[PDB]
Amino acid sequence: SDRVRSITLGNSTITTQECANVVVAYGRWPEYLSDKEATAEDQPTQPDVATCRFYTLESVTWEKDSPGWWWKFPDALKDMGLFGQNMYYHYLGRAGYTIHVQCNASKFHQGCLLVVCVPEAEMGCSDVGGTVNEHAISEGEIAKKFSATATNGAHTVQSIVTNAGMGVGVGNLTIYPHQWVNLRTNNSATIVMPYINSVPMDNMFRHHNFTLMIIPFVSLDYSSDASTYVPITVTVAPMCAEYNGLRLATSL
Amino acid sequence: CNRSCEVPTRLNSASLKQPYITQNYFPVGTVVEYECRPGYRREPSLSPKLTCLQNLKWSTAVEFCKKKSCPNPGEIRNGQIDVPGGILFGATISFSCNTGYKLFGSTSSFCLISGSSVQWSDPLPECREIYCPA
Amino acid sequence: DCGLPPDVPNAQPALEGRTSFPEDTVITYKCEESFVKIPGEKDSVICLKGSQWSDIEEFCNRSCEVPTRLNSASLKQPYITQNYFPVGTVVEYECRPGYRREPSLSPKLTCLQNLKWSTAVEFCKK
Amino acid sequence: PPQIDNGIIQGERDHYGYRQSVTYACNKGFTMIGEHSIYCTVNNDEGEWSGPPPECRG
Numbered sequence: 001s002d003r004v005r006s007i008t009l010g011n012s013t014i015t016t017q018e019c020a021n022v023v024v025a026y027g028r029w030p031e032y033l034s035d036k037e038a039t040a041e042d043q044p045t046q047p048d049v050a051t052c053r054f055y056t057l058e059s060v061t062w063e064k065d066s067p068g069w070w071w072k073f074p075d076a077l078k079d080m081g082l083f084g085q086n087m088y089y090h091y092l093g094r095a096g097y098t099i100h101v102q103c104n105a106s107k108f109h110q111g112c113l114l115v116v117c118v119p120e121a122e123m124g125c126s127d128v129g130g131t132v133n134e135h136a137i138s139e140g141e142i143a144k145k146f147s148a149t150a151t152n153g154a155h156t157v158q159s160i161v162t163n164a165g166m167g168v169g170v171g172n173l174t175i176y177p178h179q180w181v182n183l184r185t186n187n188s189a190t191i192v193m194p195y196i197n198s199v200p201m202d203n204m205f206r207h208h209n210f211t212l213m214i215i216p217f218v219s220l221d222y223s224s225d226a227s228t229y230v231p232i233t234v235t236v237a238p239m240c241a242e243y244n245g246l247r248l249a250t251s252l
Numbered sequence: 253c254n255r256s257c258e259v260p261t262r263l264n265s266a267s268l269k270q271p272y273i274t275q276n277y278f279p280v281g282t283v284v285e286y287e288c289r290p291g292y293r294r295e296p297s298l299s300p301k302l303t304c305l306q307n308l309k310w311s312t313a314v315e316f317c318k319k320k321s322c323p324n325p326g327e328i329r330n331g332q333i334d335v336p337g338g339i340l341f342g343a344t345i346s347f348s349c350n351t352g353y354k355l356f357g358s359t360s361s362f363c364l365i366s367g368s369s370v371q372w373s374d375p376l377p378e379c380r381e382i383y384c385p386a
Numbered sequence: 387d388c389g390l391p392p393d394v395p396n397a398q399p400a401l402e403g404r405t406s407f408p409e410d411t412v413i414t415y416k417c418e419e420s421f422v423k424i425p426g427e428k429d430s431v432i433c434l435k436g437s438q439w440s441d442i443e444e445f446c447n448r449s450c451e452v453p454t455r456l457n458s459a460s461l462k463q464p465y466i467t468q469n470y471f472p473v474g475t476v477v478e479y480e481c482r483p484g485y486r487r488e489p490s491l492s493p494k495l496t497c498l499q500n501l502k503w504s505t506a507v508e509f510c511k512k
Numbered sequence: 513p514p515q516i517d518n519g520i521i522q523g524e525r526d527h528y529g530y531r532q533s534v535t536y537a538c539n540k541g542f543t544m545i546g547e548h549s550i551y552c553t554v555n556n557d558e559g560e561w562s563g564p565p566p567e568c569r570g
Binding site for chain 3: 287288290291292293294295296317318319320321322323324326340341365366367368369370371372
Binding site for chain 1: 327330332334335346348349350351352
């Protein structure tokens, strides 16, 4: 059957026995930068095992009324071993990603999650005259939570889930690389994002290349005596990662 | 009469240890030692000492005492925590509730020194749903 | 005279060696082991007219032990004077002399559901 | 087997022989600290429990 899928990067393996498929974002696989497309002149670093491997973020708890969570993903991996260190010591860095969202339940639970990878998901403030903080849009490995109602806070994001913090229709988020975790069908989704930008490399501190959103469209439901705890794990493996512009380390 | 550096400049992160804190004679080659002020803790890889150099100035300052940080502020159900400048010693955070919820409790909190450490001044408030009239 | 005071779950009354209590006697209950009294609640009964005790409701509940002593950090006020730590209680530490904060680490401990404090990290370093 | 404050023995039996076990359980609202069960050791023709029963703390 094609419901089984193994993904091996570096010293890390993920098996899944209820794979939907693999979404390769725009039909393009991560690739290293070529000479016809490069602009930075020094020789790049390509660790390629030390950095291109699965990293697991902190889980989130799917409750019966969760609006959803997001991560700004070039960020969010800055404590992940040598990937984080190479982000710290270089001015430019570049990587694609394998995102794997894991959420298992029983055959008696019902729920549907949309897992989207939104490039340049620039967000708006709750005060429509104000601007956001970095803490408002990202928290590293910690997930940023959407809201079920309009938020009122200066320097915070408008995180009511129906607008996705982006001023759009949430139901249109399927234009981006996405999968659905249907509990009656799935327990894992996986998207393979290449590097997407208007430049060949960028600073991995300054620019959030993409946001991973996990939004429950159909709420988490189960009848009593069943497990009330359903977690959601995200596993991210950088891919074809390279770095340029080595100097002393940034101190956030 | 002979030479010396000025009294070491005041640091927000660290204070001179005894006996240097009472001294005013610091000829070339004098090494003083600091200890962390409340709100800060030692960065062990860095030296907490300054040397009086030959040009009558103290050596370069490094962050041998770094800010003591408060715990994770956590989360408010149906509300939000505004953290505008970090959660280190002296920081401020503020609380609000989403549309349709009313805040009960403190509207802000500060990272202040608490005995041996730093702690949040006030606990997380609560966001209570509102009712329309009948 | 009233007879034996009412049974209270997870609490024991101080009878002081007698079994018949004159009117207006006030008997206090103390929570049993692994239980903490709930602030703002009655812990005592009184023998009313007609040889009848006043009603009392359960006033004891759960908590973690006093947080263990750390050489690197001490509990901040008001936690340092407290002994009631029900599940979900978060205390905060500050560095003892000789130590300074490791800013990337939290100086807070949470009382978990198994009545133990969360894992200790070196939030105060030498 | 010894009884414990704020806990019970689960289905206590009349007689416990070599390597037989006694399982403890704390009452509602009490937290178990220690071994969930203890068992009968036997040496020099004398029985003895493997160790102290657990604590049930409030």
